[PDB]
Symmetry: C2
Subunit: 313 residues, 2 copies
Amino acid sequence: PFFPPLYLGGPEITTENCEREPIHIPGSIQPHGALLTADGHSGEVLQMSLNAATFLGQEPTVLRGQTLAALLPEQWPALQAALPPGCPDALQYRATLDWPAAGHLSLTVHRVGELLILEFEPTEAPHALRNAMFALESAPNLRALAEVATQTVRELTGFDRVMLYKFAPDATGEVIAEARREGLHAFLGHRFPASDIPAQARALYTRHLLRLTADTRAAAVPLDPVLNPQTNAPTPLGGAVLRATSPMHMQYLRNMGVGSSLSVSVVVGGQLWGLIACHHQTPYVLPPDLRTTLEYLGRLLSLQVQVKEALEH
Amino acid sequence: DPLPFFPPLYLGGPEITTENCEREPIHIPGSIQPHGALLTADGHSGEVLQMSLNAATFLGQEPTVLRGQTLAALLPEQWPALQAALPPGCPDALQYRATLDWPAAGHLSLTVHRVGELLILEFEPTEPHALRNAMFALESAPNLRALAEVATQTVRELTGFDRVMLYKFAPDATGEVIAEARREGLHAFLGHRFPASDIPAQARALYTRHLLRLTADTRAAAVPLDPVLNPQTNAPTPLGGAVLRATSPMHMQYLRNMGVGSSLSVSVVVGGQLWGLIACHHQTPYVLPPDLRTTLEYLGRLLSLQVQVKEALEH
Ligand SMILES: *C/C=C1/C(=C/c2[nH]c(/C=C3[NH+]=C(/C=C4\NC(=O)C(C=C)=C4C)C(C)=C\3CCC(=O)O)c(CCC(=O)O)c2C)NC(=O)[C@H]1C
Ligand SMILES: *C/C=C1/C(=C/c2[nH]c(/C=C3[NH+]=C(/C=C4\NC(=O)C(C=C)=C4C)C(C)=C\3CCC(=O)O)c(CCC(=O)O)c2C)NC(=O)[C@H]1C
């Protein structure tokens, strides 16, 4: 099963109980964005991140009464149609708001049962993706495909280190390709134990295909209330990219000297084949539109891995 | 019966009838569609060899001036990028794309690929979260039918085409329309089936390697290359990989007879085989700009993946 989260007086995690930390329900988010939850029917704002006032520019109480209808007039009917009752928690809808306080915000919404989860992040506003797609497809074998993928991602993102991290049948991981800035340790060829990415992290990554820690030293921002009014239970945040990273994994990243981390799942035959894993030495908020490019690349790599593995077997 | 290609018309080959369809050499027509321009150049020196006859009007230069310069001089910023992206021996399927600001012609999209020692350069005029939203909707579709319907509707919304169909090949190469989105008033093709020869075997082979082809105006005359043969080889210039390549006149007649002014299909490739086509129709001529066509190319790949996934959920 899972332990209760901390804020419901559950045990603190150790290396004895890696597998039982409820990472999906941390009750908090990373501070480079803001999150609101809301009722599926009424559009009634039920929870907000204590930092919402910053991003939205709204007097705190104003929000926690109001309706999405009021708050987002153009958007609220689109949401209603895009995310019908009963849809999967994996389905997401995005829009760009030109919002008074903040030039442009990206809005990302998904639905978990009766709750809409809304994420707001700063945003903005060429051929590198098309060029990359053809490059991946003409790679002659899996090894070269891995090399092209890591190089392409590094060029698109500027990340200090990009790896392709492949799982063995026992969930031992191996770095099979790597693109990195001069003057970093090489992780190429290294294998790591399955517990470094515990089973409950791997399952969540099979369904929700991108996560990140924008700053490995930033404090999480609580949800208020912490419990969903609807259920008097924790809000599931696993489909939210803003979700606070596990403090165990933040300790892991700091001990490696990483300041920013991001990864994309490569899913083949319904299973987690591996990860595009990225490191930056310093804090780094990759903007939403560039993340989208990596999300596309994730799908394309999933296709090409199967194609390429089929021409060996 | 499968038989080798006839020589093209310009090398004294025969004219093509319903009798000998499968033998038209549709990859070497010696000509392009008039809404863009094409140059060929030597892959090592960058000497310009062939050009479409309309090139002066896209590129704003006399032929003899174009042909008298190397790509190093014509494309000083792109020439080194081309050479890195398209190394000798690379496959003909690999494409490099850039946007140019050309004085006379505005923003041009440049698409380049390499066939042996030849570079092929295509120039076309070029111009929010719809793709991301579509990607997730496709993935959440519960079964093959719902996927097919979401895919057709999405493509129609992105493009404005009068008719978008998902055409699926059977094992005997007969096809069947299995989903479609269509303009009000058009008659339905859903559930209809068409003989295997409607798309002969040399077209299906090409359609497994080069995943997007089109006919922007089914009444437009083709524009010859000049000279027609590659001076490197005194042989035909391979245009299989060029979206500007002229469509088979057999096929343009089949389209005009249907009332179609514009056609475009994306290949859906599963396990190395052509599974089906996203086929689109417009009643009037219609040019879809290169950046919009890129969205369809990306959806072609997504759909190939999702078709595998939906079919595996099915035994
Ligand atoms: C008691 C449990 C421990 C634990 C937990 C844990 N680990 C993750 C997630 C990740 N761990 C990763 C590991 C590596 N990254 C590398 O670069 C290398 C090798 C050079 C390794 C071995 C990775 C890539 C992830 C994914 C997330 C990311 O990209 O940063 C989680 C989940 C975190 C979250 O999503 O909130 C958890 C709980 N890690 C341990 O080492 C043990 C002690
Ligand atoms: C004597 C040969 C004939 C022939 C040749 C031919 N056909 C193609 C390509 C295509 N034919 C298609 C047929 C259909 N379009 C539809 O909308 C339907 C059903 C409602 C069918 C059956 C299609 C879709 C294509 C693909 C290209 C496109 O999307 O337009 C070629 C190759 C063309 C080229 O690449 O230049 C050739 C030679 N078709 C016949 O019917 C016989 C008479």
